[PDB]
Each structure stands twice: as structure tokens, then as C-alpha cells.
Design a protein around this motif. Structure first.
Motif, PDB file in Angstrom:
ATOM      1  N   UNK C  24       0.814  -1.209   0.000  1.00 14.59           N
ATOM      2  CA  UNK C  24       0.000   0.000   0.000  1.00 14.59           C
ATOM      3  C   UNK C  24       0.847   1.259   0.000  1.00 14.59           C
ATOM      4  N   UNK C  25       2.137   1.152   0.306  1.00 13.59           N
ATOM      5  CA  UNK C  25       3.042   2.269   0.103  1.00 13.59           C
ATOM      6  C   UNK C  25       3.664   2.271  -1.280  1.00 13.59           C
ATOM      7  N   UNK C  28      -0.344   1.864  -4.589  1.00 14.36           N
ATOM      8  CA  UNK C  28      -1.740   2.239  -4.396  1.00 14.36           C
ATOM      9  C   UNK C  28      -2.220   3.324  -5.354  1.00 14.36           C
ATOM     10  N   UNK C  29      -1.356   4.272  -5.727  1.00 11.39           N
ATOM     11  CA  UNK C  29      -1.757   5.302  -6.683  1.00 11.39           C
ATOM     12  C   UNK C  29      -1.972   4.698  -8.072  1.00 11.39           C
ATOM     13  N   UNK C  32      -5.678   3.122  -7.885  1.00  8.93           N
ATOM     14  CA  UNK C  32      -6.717   4.138  -7.934  1.00  8.93           C
ATOM     15  C   UNK C  32      -6.708   4.866  -9.273  1.00  8.93           C
ATOM     16  N   UNK C  39     -14.595   2.275  -4.816  1.00  9.09           N
ATOM     17  CA  UNK C  39     -14.132   2.860  -3.553  1.00  9.09           C
ATOM     18  C   UNK C  39     -13.359   1.870  -2.699  1.00  9.09           C
ATOM     19  N   UNK C  40     -12.193   1.440  -3.177  1.00  6.78           N
ATOM     20  CA  UNK C  40     -11.350   0.514  -2.429  1.00  6.78           C
ATOM     21  C   UNK C  40     -10.795   1.241  -1.209  1.00  6.78           C
ATOM     22  N   UNK C  41     -11.276   0.861  -0.033  1.00  7.78           N
ATOM     23  CA  UNK C  41     -11.009   1.617   1.176  1.00  7.78           C
ATOM     24  C   UNK C  41     -10.201   0.800   2.168  1.00  7.78           C
ATOM     25  N   UNK C  42      -9.362   1.501   2.920  1.00 11.02           N
ATOM     26  CA  UNK C  42      -8.366   0.908   3.797  1.00 11.02           C
ATOM     27  C   UNK C  42      -8.734   1.263   5.227  1.00 11.02           C
TER      28      UNK C  42
END
Ligand code: SF4
Ligand code: SF4
Ligand code: FES
Ligand SMILES: [Zn+2]
Lengths: 208, 126, 82, 107, 688, 95, 114, 48
Positions: C24-25, C28-29, C32, C39-42
Motif C-alpha cells: 500500500x506504500x 496504491x496510486x 486508484x 471505492x477501495x477503502x483501507x
């Protein structure tokens, strides 16, 4: 300090201190706390393996007669592992003294059932069985005294509420008295009366 | 003697006589009571009160009272530690929510800083 | 039909959280940028198994467990779902 | 009464024309006086016998647990030995001959 | 290691230097009795009750304002300690009238409790007893200044927290009035908190005034609404119908204070409530019926309506359980336009990636900040306890506070940068005498108000604030995990609905006009029948609707915020739950209970029965909503900032202004505060 | 002396008269609503507003230990007479 | 945790005592339904006796089963004597409940009831 | 009481309505308390 303050005596205080020390010397096996209060009544706090030895010693031994038995209760205290406290309250005849043998127990332990050495403890033991819930082993008769037969719940606990779960009323369907869940007509308003500001500094427990 | 050897939870809920409705329906909130904020005294702290949820209190249609179908609602069980509270709540059967004890923060107040020179702690009214 | 939501559930001290924080670091961009309307939410709470939930098609919530998966393994399983 | 306004309520004239007497009246009837923590058992010679009361009081404004030793209860405990070898009119005479009121025997 | 030995009553304890004697005696557990010391205000030595004896000393010192020398030994129960306490108590009850029956703090006074547990029994002072003419501080605060003991705690509170400077001592000797000299109504925020500060029954409550008595009303833990901070509250309830809202204390947020609207907003909670499910009658009217008729009607219509044409506006004061049940049901139907009333922008990863829609630092964590810049808000009227926290920080240590957008009546002398988004553009560029202060600061905070985010420039303003955040993230050494940027909200259910993943704004309904919509507490002019096709089928669900309740089609009486076991999220992600203190009057079921029963009556089901299963699905949607009263902040400012870098919007240079500009607009802009009468009385008192 | 609603039933000093949609109108059938016909508001507006030549004056209630405890009230406002909370009867000053 | 017992050592004596008590309750019903002049057939009484024994079926601790055996033996002695009346033996049954249902929907029409 | 009839007090009954149980004129209890929670009123106008 002379008017309207109860004058304490120190002779009875010194004698009960000496006698409590003497009792705990001659019975080392079962004795944990020996306390004398400010108004000179003795209390001996006891493991529940020696109810018969302590009471057979205390009814006899000729230096402490203690023929008479009074209140027996086992005050229903939460917050502990062993909840109940059984209080044998022994009164002498030759001596004018009062000692309280306080043994401890939890909910599921037979204490040694003092009915064989105090015949007055028969209905006391049966009443404490019915009201609190402490079973007494090697005992002739355990029935329900002071409660209804169809009633159960051991009501003198702190866990049983003030109003019971059942409530009786007559009805004409089955032409008899039936039990229904309680529907009170007024709330029994509980008041929050325990005000702060520490009315006794001498009884402050040490904090954590 | 000491014949029984077992390490298991207690199951007094079938012995204490309260029915299954009031066993598995209600819930026990375990909390230190908050200080009564109009007074200033924390003697009302130091006692873990166990209380239950409240339920319906309708109006008695002849006088205007608060009738209730609640035996267990008027209880309070004052304890001394969280561990014995959790042990009693798990022993006697019902559900429990244990809240938190929130101590007052140890601050540092000073009259000499209430009368400072360059700082903005200048009370200007005493 | 298709997806509606993708939810990730993480923690802050774990090797599985180490792997999905690596994902996710680093990537992730990209994700998206690829799908705009998912809406993939963390979510991160304190300590939990790193679940991955796909909610779609009348309440079908398929579940995979991202316990100690590395970032390549996370991306491969996420593309297996999506 | 005693010379202490914190236990006995003050008399009504001092209550009206005094501030501290009104405060002690108000708190002494709402909260009540507190009792120091401890347990006691006293007993006095009631006409039935040693009427006993055993108070256990947490330091608060309410008692924690009270219990009552009833001489009628202790006398009714020995009804077997008092009516083992007699007839039933004598059983009624034995029940009568001890001042048993059956409200005190209940506790 | 900065330790001093004090022998409190002989018992030794180590105490840090600088602290008072009373903090040491509370460190061992003692309470020295006191009237003008308070643990949130500055220490004055007026009341003199706090006296205590130090061994080997001639004088009796004041424990409220005495620092600690090396090696004390303090007697709290000696002879002259008790003589001094009984003396000061015998002085205090002289010029204090005989009002303990008619008084309002009769159960909760401090003169009474301390004159029991420390004072004398018989009185003296045969003749005298001055009487002072009472004032009128406000129409919300009843004021009998005869009972005042001149402890000077209302004044220290007003001057140091409310910042108003209206209360003053006037006179000398016995004649020391405490009040306003100029007949002026003391009307400001946190004016309600002064009734808990005054320890005697002088400054008492006006709507509560003569209606209860505190040994009867039972206390219940609960959580506030209408404020994003969510102050802790205790409802002292009477007998299944309540009394009052005292503030329950939390150390991080909302310490011992409360908002005025929170304190005086239950009259509307008992004034216009809905008790019966209501159906539009074909004559044209709005009659009422049983649950079977309304739920069968809504069930048949929801069975005969599917697709992308079903909407759920869940605004105002709603739960988390209600949101889970509504989202689960409307997931089961076909699809979603689930919306909130207030508009938050979602272009650069709005709902996801938690950090860009909540308040990242702790509300208590702003005390260690140094440079705070407010953009597009008036924090006096939007979570006023956050403003009290800012003023407490600015008062005790130093803060460079700068405001962008509106010259408003903050009480703590902000610096002012102007009213233009191009000013924020140029701060992001790097040309000001204040951006230098930012890049020379240590722990900076940029607080964005959501009220200026409702307008048509929202994503651009948020992108510029993320520019400031990434700019300080780059042009500094990373001292730690400090967080520059955060926003704040107005209503807590927007935070909960964006945690559960709703669409913010009403744009999804502006694109697709639906045939059926659920108004879970739609307060204002969100949508009407004029913005929608003819077959409306508005199902309103809530309590005392005033806007929309005539407009709607099926009225369902939902519960209230003191009347159900809810789950609420403050502006910083902490989960706080209410408790059922009073069952809702009328039929008046809960919200998720209505929704799951509606699911049962319709041709489907929701796969759960009771509230523990509801909270299990709440954890199976978002996991932080079971760790109650606990916080954990988000991260990924770089990823949020680079996701903000795709869509450029023109920043309109119109003067951005918050709507919460004055007292009337603080007081009226909610449904519960709108329905009441006490808010209307203080509205006409302020406006006149 | 007392008001009466157009339903035909007497109101009390507290305005608690029933509506057209109650059943307590039927519980009052055959048995009279024993209302006190002596209101407490209007027996004070008939009292003479006393005028006492001092500034801060006492109030007992007509008798030692027959009446409310002493309240000392202030009479310094010019347009609003001081009012005992216990008594209910006003005072004024004369100078 | 070496706990003192009541009667038993493990669940074996517990099962033996509870089947002894069930045998006693089985042979104790028809005498009482002839004696107290009830209105219920013998088979329904035996079915509710075995229902009362099936109610506590999830109990595992041996002291607790011993104490339940003691409770049942006390009540069987009080019913084999003529001490308990017709009221209490009919109070064991439930004829005057008008029993509340267990579906969520009928608990919803008479609400505030979790 | 022909010596000193005390405390005349104009509100005192001059009739002394006697013990009246089992009459048409006796006491019935009722709540001396006004409206509790003030239920909502629907609007009078229709839509469309
Ligand atoms: S403030 Fe306290 S002392 Fe004064 S009248 Fe009220 S209760 Fe009594
Ligand atoms: S009004 Fe209250 S807070 Fe202010 S000085 Fe008087 S007693 Fe203290
Ligand atoms: S607290 Fe020290 S003087 Fe009031
Ligand atoms: Zn008066």
C-alpha cells in the motif's frame, strides 16, 4: 470529651487481647485473624477446615465455657472469591464474654455443619441453607424454612433483586392462585444518597 | 481430602433461579461512576459499580407513576477491582461491557506564573 | 455483473501488516488510477488479521485472508479477486 | 436528646433561627448520619429473652447487613424435647407457655 | 530525578517540584476541603477553607497555593487544622440565607457537605445577615446573588476560558457584589458551564430551576450529538422521563465543560416528537395507523422498485447501527445512491484513505502545536470546546494563530491573513511573511473547516491544503509523526457515514433522480419534491421532523439520541456509544430494528437478529467501531497528496465566509435546537 | 372562582383538564371530581403590598416556630418589589 | 485447584445420582396426580418431568450436578409428603402465561423488547 | 369551644361535608399533571 461520648474501658480490652492471643497460641492450625474492636468484643477469623475442632474446643476446655450459641449468619459479600462469612456468635455463662468465630466459604463448599455440637444450630443451619445457598454436609435434615415451596432463588443474596421474579394472584380460569412475572405499580425509586467528602479519615484504605 | 481436580468456569446460572430471559437478554455495564460534577469530591470513585441497562417505565394510568416490568433494574454491585468484576460477571452468566477508569491528569499550577511579566498568563482581575 | 467495493483491514505491527504496508506504500496510486469508481477503502485499527473483502452482486462478500503475504503475493491475490 | 446536632436532629426553634441547624436538619434527614465501618452484636433482655441484633455496617449512610436473634425462634427450636413424651393438649400448652408471636420467629 | 520528599501524615511520598500541597495530598488520596480551588482554573487564595498545618511552624498555610519545600511533614488531622476549618466554616455560614429548602443545589451543595463533615454543630451570630440585591446575568442562568460566598470562581472562569470579561467584583468589606455593573446580559458561548462552576446555589439553571432534586434522578452515561467533538454527558433522568444533562468528564476531549446548545437542548427533545407511524390519506391528508399498514406499504413498494433508482439520504443525527442496516438492506435490493446531507468532496480519494476526512491529531494533541492556521471556519460556533482547547493552549503556552476567510469574534486575538483562496495559493507558492513562520515552526497544524467546504470550490481548497501539508512535509526535517493537516466537521454522522463508505454530497441524486428515497433525518433543504419526479415515495424516518415531515409520504417515528443504544464517532475517529436512559415515547421503535423488520416484511432478510450480531457486522464492515473510547490515527499523506494531483479546478475568488457568524446562527441551526423553546427565548434575547 | 373547560369539567389550579379523546371522563361518571375551588394565585394578589421604612427587612411568618424560617430580603430596586420565596407576600421601602 | 467435593469424584457418580433421581420422579408422579386431584394426564406430567431434566443438560461441573441432585431430592421429598398443596404443583406447569412469541416480527409489534 | 373558637381564616368550610363513601359525591383519584411530551400535529394542507 466527657459529655455525650461513650466511655470505653481498657480492662476488658486488655483481657480480650490476652485471651485472643491465648486462643491463637493453643490452636495454631486454624487461626488467621485475631481482632479486638474498640468496644471490646472478640473476633477470630477462621479457615473452613476447623469448625468442629474450634467449637468443640470452645464449648469445653474449662477456661472458656461458651455454652450458648447465637447468630450464625454468613453475610453475603461480593468482590471476593470466597463470598460468604459464617458467624458463630458464642456467649459464655460463667464468664460474661462474647466471641465471634467468623469462618469463610464460597458458594460451593460444605462447612463441617455444627449441628452435632450445638443443637441450637439446627434451624440456624437450615435457614442459612435456604436463604443464602451454602450446603452443609453430614447434616440430618435440609428443607426450606421461611420460604415458599414453589419459590427458589436463595433470596437474601445481593444478586437476587428486591422484588422477586414471581408474584401471586388469584384467577378464575383455573380457579386458583397462580404465579406471574412482576409488574409493579410504582418504581421503587432508588436514591443516590452516598455523598462524597470522606466522613472518616481513620478508615482510609491505601491506594494502588 | 481435596478430591476434585478441575480447572473450569463456574456455571451458577442454572442455580441462581433467574430465568433465561433475564439471563441472555440484558447486559451488565461495569464502570466507575463519574464524579457528580456539581460537587467536587472523588469519594464516589474507588468503587467499580456493576449496573444493568434500563428498560421501559410507562405511566400508571390511575395516578401518573412509573410502573415497570423490571426486577433486576434497581441493582447496583459495588466492587473494588476490575478483575473481580469481570470474574463475577462471567461466573454468574450474563453479558458484560467493561468501561474504563479515567484518572484526573496530574497538572502543575503556579500562582507565580499567574503573575508573570512577559507571558500571556496575566489574570488582570485578582 | 461486477464489483462494488474492496475493503482492506490492516494492523500496525505484524509481518502480514509489513507485507500489505509494502504493497500500500508502493502500488496504491497505480490502482486508484486504474479503476476510478471502485471505492477501495483501507482501515487500520490496532491489531487484527489483515482481511480483504470484496462486496458485490446482492451482498456476495467474498473473503480472503492476507496473513503474511508479501507484496507480490498481495497484488496477485488482489488481481485474482478483481 | 444528645448534645450533638450531627446525629440527633436539632429542635425546631434553633432550626428556624439558625443556619447550621437548618443545614444539619436537611442533610440529617436526606442522607442521614453516616456510621463508621464495623460489625457489632448487642443483645438486651427483652421479655422473651436475649433479643439480639447483629449490625454489619460499611462506612456509609445505609447498613450493609442486619440480622436478628429471636428468643422465640430459639425456644421453638426445642419443641421436640419439650413435647416428646406428652399429649397434644400438652403440645398446645407448650406452644402457649413460651411467649411466641410468630412474627419475630420469622426473620 | 526531580523528586522531593513529603511526609503526608507521616507517610512518605515522592513529589515533583513546583506542585501545590493539595496535589500532594491528592497523590496520597487525601482531600483537603476547598471552595475556590478548581482543577481547571487558576489558583486564587480567596476561600481560605483549604488551610492545613505544617509541623514545626507557627502559622497555618494555605494548601491551594503553597509550593513544596524539601522534606515536608504535613498534618491534615491535627488540632489547629480542625480549629481553622471549623472557624472558617463558622464564618461562611453567617451571611448566607436560610434557603436550603427553596435552593436548587440542595442535594449537591458544598457548604452542606463540608458543614457536615468538617464544621461545628451549634451556631452563633445572633444578629446580622446581610442581603444583596440579585442581578439578571442572562435568560438562561437564574441568578440569586444572596447565596453567593464571593469565592471568585465565576470570574476566573469567564476571564480565562470564556474570554468575555463581563463579571467583576464591585465594592469593599461585606459589600462585595459579584456581577455585571451595567445591566448587561452575559451572553456568550459556554455560558451554560457557569452553573457547574459556582459551588453554592447562586448561579443556577433557568429551565431546570424548580423541577427536580438530585437524590432522586438517576445518573446515566451518554454521548453528545450536534457537535463533532462529542462531549461526554451524564443524563440525570427522572422516572422514565428525564431531567438534565450534566457534562461527563473525559481527559482528552471536553474536559469538564459542555456546549450551551448541548446543555439546553432537551426541551426540543420533548416538545414535538413523533409517536405514531403516519401514512398519507387519499383525501390528501396525513393520518396515522398501526405498524402493519405502513410497513406493508413500504414493503410492497420496495419489492416493486429496484435498480439504480433507489436513494438513501442519511443526514443529521443518525447511528452507526442504522447506517449498517440501511446499507445492508439497500445492498440487498439492487444498488445504491446512498448520500449524506452535507457535501464533502470526493475526487482525490475522498471516502477511502482515512486521513483526508477526519481530524488526524488528538483534540487534546493541539496543545503541543505551535502554529495553528484556521481556514474557512469560525471555531467559536463550530465545536466550541475545540475553541476552548485552542484558547487554553494559546493562554498557557505560545501559539501563532492565523485565520483565513472572515473577520469574526474569536476571543483570543487571531492574526488575520484575508479572505481569498488565492491567498492560500500564494502561501503554497511561498511568498508571505507567514509561510516563513511555517517553515521555521516545529509542530504545525492546518485546520480546515467543512463549512467553507460545502461551496463549489471544495476539491481545490482541499488540494491547496494538501499542498501546504506536503510542503511542510518536504521542507523540514521529520521530527516525528506529527500531523500538520486536519479538517473538522459539524455533525458526527457524516464521519460515521464516511467511515462506512457512503457517497458524500447529493450529486449522485442530482445525476439519477430516483423513484424512492429514504430520508434518515434529512434536516434542511437537501432535496424537495420540486427536485425530483412525480412519483416521489419519500419515507422519512426520525423524530420531530420540521422540514420534510409535511413533504414526506410515509412517516416513521425513529428514536432519539438519549433513547437508544447507538454508536457514534467523533471528529477524530474515536468510537463512543450512547446508553438507553429513557425508552422512546409512543410506539417509536429504534432505527435498525425498523429496518430489519422492514426487511422481514419485504421479500428478503437481513442475516442478523439482535444487537450483538449487529455490532459483529459493524466490525465486519469497519474494525475500529468496537474499540470503544480509543483512537488510532491514519497515515499516507504522500499517497493522499499525489492522488489529489489529477483534477485541476479553478479557484473562485469570491469571499468565502462561514455561515456560523453569530449567536443566533449558532442557536437555531439544528432540528433539536430548532424545536425547543429555550433556544427561542435566548434567540430573541440576543437579537433584541 | 374557578375556570371550566367547554367540555363541562372544571379545570384545577394546574391546567390539567382532559380532552375529547380520553377515558378519564368516563372514570368520572357518577362521582364528582373533588377539585379544590380555592386557587392559591389569587389570594396573594388581593394582599396589601406592605411598605416598611427600612432597607433590608426580615420575614418570619407570624410566630416563633409557627412559620417558615427567617429570610432577610432586600428592597433596593425601584420598579420590582422584593418577594419572599417562602411567604409570597411583597414588601417596599419608604424614605 | 484441589476443590472439596459435595458427593462425587467426577461425572460418573453425577450421572448415577441423576438417573436414580429420575427413576424416583418417574415412580412418584401418578401417586401425586391421584392424590392432589389435578387435571392433567400422567403422560404429560412425565413429559414435563423429563423436560425439567432436559433443561439443565449443558451443566458439566460435578459439584453443580450434585447440588441439583440435592435440590431435586428435597422437592421430591416435599411432594411425596403432603406438605405442598395443589397450587405449587400446578405452579410447576404453565397454563396462565398467554406466552410471548419468539419471532422478531411479533416482538417488533410489541416493542422495546430485545 | 363556646369560650374561644380560634383562627377564623375565611377559606375554612362553613358546611363540613361529612363522611361520604358510597354516595354520588366522593373522591376519585386522578393525575394532577399537565401534558407530558406534546405529540406532533400534522399539517392541514394536502400536497397536489
Ligand atoms: S447554596 Fe447550599 S447552603 Fe446556600 S441555600 Fe443552597 S443548599 Fe443551602
Ligand atoms: S457567584 Fe458562585 S462562583 Fe461566583 S463568586 Fe459567588 S459563589 Fe463563587
Ligand atoms: S482553596 Fe486555598 S483559599 Fe480557597
Ligand atoms: Zn417569608
Amino acid at each position: 470529651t466527657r459529655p455525650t461520648v461513650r466511655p470505653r474501658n481498657d480492662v476488658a480490652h486488655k483481657q480480650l487481647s490476652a485471651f485472643g492471643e491465648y486462643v491463637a497460641e493453643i490452636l495454631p492450625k486454624y487461626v488467621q485473624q485475631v481482632q479486638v474492636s474498640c468496644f471490646s468484643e472478640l473476633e477470630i477469623c477462621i479457615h473452613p477446615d476447623g469448625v468442629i475442632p474450634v467449637l468443640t474446643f470452645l464449648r469445653d476446655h474449662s477456661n472458656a465455657q461458651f455454652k450458648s450459641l447465637a447468630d450464625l449468619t454468613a453475610v453475603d459479600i461480593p468482590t471476593r472469591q470466597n463470598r460468604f462469612e459464617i458467624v458463630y456468635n458464642l456467649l459464655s455463662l460463667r464468664f460474661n464474654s462474647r466471641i465471634r468465630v467468623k469462618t469463610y466459604t464460597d458458594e460451593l463448599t460444605p462447612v463441617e455443619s455444627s449441628v452435632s455440637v450445638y443443637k441450637a444450630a439446627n434451624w440456624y443451619e437450615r435457614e442459612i441453607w435456604d436463604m443464602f445457598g451454602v450446603f452443609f454436609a453430614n447434616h440430618p435434615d435440609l428443607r426450606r424454612i421461611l420460604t415458599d415451596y414453589g419459590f427458589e432463588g436463595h433470596p437474601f443474596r445481593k444478586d437476587f433483586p428486591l422484588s422477586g421474579y414471581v408474584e401471586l394472584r388469584y384467577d378464575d380460569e383455573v380457579k386458583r392462585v397462580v404465579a406471574e412475572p412482576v409488574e409493579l405499580a410504582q418504581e421503587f425509586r432508588k436514591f443516590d444518597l452516598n455523598s462524597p467528602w470522606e466522613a472518616f479519615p481513620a478508615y482510609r484504605q491505601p491506594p494502588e | 481430602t481435596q478430591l476434585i481436580t478441575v480447572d473450569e468456569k463456574l456455571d451458577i446460572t442454572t442455580l441462581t433461579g433467574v430465568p433465561e430471559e433475564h439471563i441472555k437478554t440484558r447486559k451488565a455495564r461495569i464502570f466507575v461512576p463519574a464524579r457528580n460534577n456539581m460537587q467536587s469530591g472523588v469519594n464516589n470513585t474507588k468503587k467499580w459499580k456493576m449496573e444493568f441497562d434500563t428498560r421501559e417505565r410507562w405511566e400508571n394510568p390511575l395516578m401518573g407513576w412509573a410502573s415497570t416490568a423490571d426486577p433486576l433494574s434497581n441493582l447496583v454491585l459495588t466492587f473494588s477491582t476490575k478483575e473481580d468484576a469481570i470474574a463475577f460477571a462471567e461466573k454468574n452468566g450474563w453479558s458484560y461491557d467493561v468501561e474504563e477508569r479515567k484518572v484526573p491528569k496530574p497538572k502543575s499550577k503556579s500562582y507565580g506564573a499567574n503573575f508573570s511579566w512577559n507571558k500571556r498568563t496575566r489574570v488582570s482581575t485578582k | 455483473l461486477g464489483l462494488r467495493e474492496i475493503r482492506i483491514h490492516l494492523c500496525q505491527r505484524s509481518p502480514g501488516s509489513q507485507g500489505v504496508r509494502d504493497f500500500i506504500e508502493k502500488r496504491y496510486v497505480e490502482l486508484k488510477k486504474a479503476n476510478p469508481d471502485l471505492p477501495i477503502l483501507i482501515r487500520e485499527c490496532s491489531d487484527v488479521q489483515p482481511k480483504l473483502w470484496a462486496r458485490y452482486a446482492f451482498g456476495q462478500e467474498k473473503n480472503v485472508s492476507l496473513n503474511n503475504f508479501s507484496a507480490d503475493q498481495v497484488t496477485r491475490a488482489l488481481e485474482n479477486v478483481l | 436528646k444528645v448534645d450533638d446536632a450531627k446525629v440527633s436532629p436539632p429542635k425546631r426553634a434553633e432550626m428556624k433561627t439558625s443556619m447550621e441547624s437548618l443545614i444539619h436538619h436537611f442533610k440529617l434527614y436526606t442522607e442521614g448520619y453516616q456510621v463508621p465501618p464495623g460489625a457489632t452484636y448487642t443483645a438486651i433482655e427483652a421479655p422473651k429473652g436475649e433479643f439480639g441484633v447483629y449490625l454489619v455496617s460499611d462506612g456509609s449512610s445505609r447498613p450493609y447487613r442486619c440480622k436478628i436473634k429471636a428468643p422465640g425462634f430459639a425456644h421453638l427450636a426445642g419443641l421436640d424435647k419439650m413435647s416428646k413424651g406428652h399429649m397434644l393438649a400438652d403440645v398446645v400448652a407448650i406452644i402457649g407457655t413460651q411467649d411466641i408471636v410468630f412474627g419475630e420467629v420469622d426473620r | 530525578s526531580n523528586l522531593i520528599e513529603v511526609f503526608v501524615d507521616g507517610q512518605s511520598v515522592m513529589v515533583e517540584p513546583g506542585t501545590t500541597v493539595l496535589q500532594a495530598c491528592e497523590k496520597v488520596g487525601m482531600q483537603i476541603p476547598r471552595f475556590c480551588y478548581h482543577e481547571r482554573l487558576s489558583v486564587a487564595g480567596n476561600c481560605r477553607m483549604c488551610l492545613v498545618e505544617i509541623e514545626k511552624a507557627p502559622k497555618v498555610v494555605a494548601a491551594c497555593a503553597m509550593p513544596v519545600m524539601k522534606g515536608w511533614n504535613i498534618l491534615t488531622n491535627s488540632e489547629k487544622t480542625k480549629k481553622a476549618r471549623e472557624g472558617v466554616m463558622e464564618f461562611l455560614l453567617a451571611n448566607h440565607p436560610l434557603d436550603c429548602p427553596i435552593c436548587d443545589q440542595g442535594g449537591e451543595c458544598d457548604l452542606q457537605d463540608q458543614s457536615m463533615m468538617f464544621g461545628s454543630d451549634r451556631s452563633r451570630f445572633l444578629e446580622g445577615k446581610r442581603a444583596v440585591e440579585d442581578k439578571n446575568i442572562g435568560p438562561l442562568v437564574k441568578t440569586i446573588m444572596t447565596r453567593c460566598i464571593q469565592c471568585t470562581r465565576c470570574i476566573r472562569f469567564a476571564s480565562e476560558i470564556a474570554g468575555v470579561d463581563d463579571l467583576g467584583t464591585t465594592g469593599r468589606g461585606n459589600d462585595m457584589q459579584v456581577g455585571t455593573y451595567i445591566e448587561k446580559m452575559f451572553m456568550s458561548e459556554l455560558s451554560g458551564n457557569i452553573i457547574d462552576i459556582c459551588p453554592v446555589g447562586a448561579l443556577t439553571s433557568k429551565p431546570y430551576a424548580f423541577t427536580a432534586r438530585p437524590w432522586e434522578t438517576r445518573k446515566t452515561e451518554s454521548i453528545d450529538v450536534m457537535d463533532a467533538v462529542g462531549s461526554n454527558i451524564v443524563v440525570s433522568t427522572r422516572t422514565g422521563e428525564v431531567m438534565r444533562i450534566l457534562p461527563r468528564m473525559h481527559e482528552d476531549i471536553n474536559e469538564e465543560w459542555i456546549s450551551d446548545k448541548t446543555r439546553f437542548a432537551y426541551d426540543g427533545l420533548k416538545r414535538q416528537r413523533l409517536t405514531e407511524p403516519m401514512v398519507r390519506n387519499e383525501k390528501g391528508l396525513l393520518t396515522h395507523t398501526t405498524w402493519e399498514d405502513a410497513l406493508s406499504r413500504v414493503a410492497g413498494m420496495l419489492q416493486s422498485c429496484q435498480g439504480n433508482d433507489v436513494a438513501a439520504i442519511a443526514g443529521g443525527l443518525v447511528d452507526a447501527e442504522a447506517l449498517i442496516a440501511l446499507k445492508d438492506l439497500l445492498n440487498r435490493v439492487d444498488s445504491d445512491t446512498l448520500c449524506t446531507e452535507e457535501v464533502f468532496p470526493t475526487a482525490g480519494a475522498g471516502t477511502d484513505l482515512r486521513s483526508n476526512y477526519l481530524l488526524n491529531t488528538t483534540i487534546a494533541g493541539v496543545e503541543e502545536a505551535d502554529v495553528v492556521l484556521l481556514v474557512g471556519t469560525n471555531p467559536r460556533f463550530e465545536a466550541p470546546l475545540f475553541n476552548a482547547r485552542i484558547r487554553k493552549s494559546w493562554l498557557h503556552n505560545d501559539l501563532k494563530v492565523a485565520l483565513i476567510g472572515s473577520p469574526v469574534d474569536l476571543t483570543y486575538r487571531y492574526d488575520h491573513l484575508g479572505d481569498s483562496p488565492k491567498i492560500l495559493q500564494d502561501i503554497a507558492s511561498g511568498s508571505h511573511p507567514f509561510s516563513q513562520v511555517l517553515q521555521e515552526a516545529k509542530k504545525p497544524m492546518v485546520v480546515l473547516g467543512s463549512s467553507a467546504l460545502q461551496r463549489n470550490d471544495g476539491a481545490a481548497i482541499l488540494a491547496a491544503v494538501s499542498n501546504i501539508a506536503q510542503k511542510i512535509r518536504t521542507s523540514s526535517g521529520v521530527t516525528g509523526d506529527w500531523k500538520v493537516m486536519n479538517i473538522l466537521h459539524r455533525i458526527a454522522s457524516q464521519v460515521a457515514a464516511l467511515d462506512l463508505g457512503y457517497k458524500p454530497g447529493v450529486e449522485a441524486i442530482r445525476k439519477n433522480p430516483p423513484k424512492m428515497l429514504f430520508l434518515l433525518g434529512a434536516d434542511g433543504g437537501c432535496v424537495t419534491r420540486q427536485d425530483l419526479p412525480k412519483d416521489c415515495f419519500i419515507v422519512y424516518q426520525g423524530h420531530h421532523g420540521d422540514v420534510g415531515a409535511p413533504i414526506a409520504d410515509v412517516i416513521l417515528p425513529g428514536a432519539a439520541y438519549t433513547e437508544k443504544s447507538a454508536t457514534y464517532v467523533n471528529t477524530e475517529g474515536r468510537a463512543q456509544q450512547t446508553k438507553v436512559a429513557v425508552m422512546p415515547p409512543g410506539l417509536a421503535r429504534e432505527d435498525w430494528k425498523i429496518i430489519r423488520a422492514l426487511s422481514e416484511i419485504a421479500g428478503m432478510t437481513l442475516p442478523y437478529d439482535t444487537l450483538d450480531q449487529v455490532r459483529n457486522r459493524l466490525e465486519e464492515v469497519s474494525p475500529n467501531l468496537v474499540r470503544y473510547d480509543d483512537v488510532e490515527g491514519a497515515n499516507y499523506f504522500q499517497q493522499a497528496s499525489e492522488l489529489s494531483k489529477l483534477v485541476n479546478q479553478q479557484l473562485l475568488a469570491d469571499p468565502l465566509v462561514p455561515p456560523q457568524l453569530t449567536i443566533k446562527d449558532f442557536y437555531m441551526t439544528d432540528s433539536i435546537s430548532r424545536a425547543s423553546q429555550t433556544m427561542a427565548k435566548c434567540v430573541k434575547a440576543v437579537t433584541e | 372562582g374557578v375556570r371550566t373547560s367547554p367540555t363541562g369539567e372544571k379545570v384545577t389550579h394546574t391546567g390539567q383538564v382532559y380532552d375529547d379523546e380520553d377515558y378519564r371522563r368516563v372514570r368520572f361518571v357518577g362521582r364528582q371530581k373533588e377539585v379544590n375551588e380555592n386557587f392559591a394565585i389569587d389570594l396573594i394578589a388581593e394582599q396589601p403590598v406592605s411598605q416598611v421604612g427600612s432597607r433590608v427587612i426580615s420575614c418570619d411568618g407570624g410566630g416563633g416556630a409557627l412559620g417558615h424560617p427567617r429570610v432577610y430580603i432586600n428592597l433596593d430596586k425601584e420598579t420590582k418589589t422584593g418577594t419572599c420565596g417562602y411567604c409570597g407576600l411583597q414588601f417596599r421601602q419608604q424614605h | 485447584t484441589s476443590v472439596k467435593p459435595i458427593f462425587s469424584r467426577d461425572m460418573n457418580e453425577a450421572k448415577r445420582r441423576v438417573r436414580e433421581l429420575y427413576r424416583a420422579w418417574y415412580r412418584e408422579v401418578p401417586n401425586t396426580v391421584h392424590l392432589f386431584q389435578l387435571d392433567i394426564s400422567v403422560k404429560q406430567g412425565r413429559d414435563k418431568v423429563r423436560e425439567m431434566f432436559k433443561k439443565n443438560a449443558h451443566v458439566t461441573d460435578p459439584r453443580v450436578v450434585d447440588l441439583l441432585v440435592i435440590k431435586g431430592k428435597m422437592e421430591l421429598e416435599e411432594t411425596i409428603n403432603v406438605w405442598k398443596q395443589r397450587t405449587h404443583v400446578m405452579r410447576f406447569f404453565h397454563e396462565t402465561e398467554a406466552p410471548r412469541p419468539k419471532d422478531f416480527l411479533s416482538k417488533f409489534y410489541v416493542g422495546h423488547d430485545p | 369551644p363556646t369560650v374561644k373558637p380560634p383562627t377564623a381564616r375565611k377559606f375554612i368550610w362553613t358546611n363540613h361535608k361529612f363522611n361520604l363513601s358510597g354516595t354520588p359525591q366522593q373522591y376519585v383519584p386522578y393525575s394532577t399533571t399537565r401534558k407530558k411530551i406534546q405529540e406532533w400535529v400534522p399539517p392541514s394542507t394536502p400536497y397536489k
